[PDB]
């Protein structure tokens, strides 16, 4: 599968692609305002994620720190990023179909549009100003809007017992971004795409 990661934000972001235990393609790259980064994800990839990182500082060896989405301090991400991260989640070639979605379960840092570049399905988008409207107890000092589970670490916010309902914090992400997961047991906004589809991830799609 081909993913075109486009940065339409006015600021530089550091794109990141990982499946949890391994990097997707290079795993991470700097994206200036307007730059595009095309990566190749192996078919059958399960649990792949793409997100943006803000205010990063790496050395010549690719080791550093980001204010949002830091993946163990590496420019090329092998693990998932540190919240708050707007997540482009996808599972490819699952019994003949691809499944994509946008998730606010791990917070919000950059607006994002997750659309296919091939026919067969629609795209998802979470481009509201969640950071500007973020509740006080969820505002991340380093930028972005944390999720309730990251802030308070309770069973109800993290849905650890598998029995959880929507909260006042999750209803905030759902109100500004109804097409994205607000919590774990939220009504699925997953889009079913044809198998072996190609996609484009656009940071700040309305910029």
From Swiss-Prot:
GO cellular component: cytoplasmic vesicle
PROSITE patterns registered for this protein in UniProt: THAUMATIN_1 (PS00316), THAUMATIN_2 (PS51367)
Xref: InterPro entries: Osmotin/thaumatin-like_sf, Thaumatin, Thaumatin_CS
Keywords attached to this entry: Cytoplasmic vesicle, Disulfide bond, Signal, Taste-modifying protein
Subcellular location: Cytoplasmic vesicle
Disulfide feature: 9-204, 56-66, 71-77, 121-193, 126-177, 134-145, 149-158, 159-164
One matching Pfam family: Thaumatin
UniProt xrefs under Gene3D superfamilies: Thaumatin (2.60.110.10)
Main location: cytoplasm
Protein purpose: Taste-modifying protein; intensely sweet-tasting. It is 100000 times sweeter than sucrose on a molar basis.
Family assignment from sequence similarity: Belongs to the thaumatin family.
The protein's name: Thaumatin I
Native organism: Thaumatococcus daniellii (Katemfe)
Lineage: Eukaryota, Viridiplantae, Streptophyta, Embryophyta, Tracheophyta
């Amino acid at each position: 599968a081909t993913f075109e990661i486009v940065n339409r934000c006015s600021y530089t972001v550091w794109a990141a692609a990982s499946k949890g235990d391994a990097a997707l393609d290079a795993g991470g790259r700097q994206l200036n305002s307007g730059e595009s980064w095309t990566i190749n994800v192996e078919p059958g990839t399960n649990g792949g994620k793409i997100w943006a990182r803000t205010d990063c500082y790496f050395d010549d060896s690719g080791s550093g720190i980001c204010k949002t989405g830091d993946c163990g301090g590496l420019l090329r991400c092998k693990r998932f990023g540190r919240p708050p991260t707007t997540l482009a989640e996808f599972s490819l070639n699952q019994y003949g179909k691809d499944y994509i979605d946008i998730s606010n379960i791990k917070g919000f840092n950059v607006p994002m549009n997750f659309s296919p570049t091939t026919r067969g399905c629609r795209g998802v988008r979470c481009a509201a100003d969640i950071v500007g409207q973020c509740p006080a107890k969820l505002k991340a000092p380093g930028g972005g809007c944390n999720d309730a589970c990251t802030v308070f670490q309770t069973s109800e916010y993290c849905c650890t017992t598998g029995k959880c309902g929507p909260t006042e914090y999750s209803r905030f992400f759902k109100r500004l971004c109804p097409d994205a997961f607000s919590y774990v047991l939220d009504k699925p906004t997953t889009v079913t795409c044809p198998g072996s589809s190609n996609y484009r991830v656009t940071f700040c799609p309305t910029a």
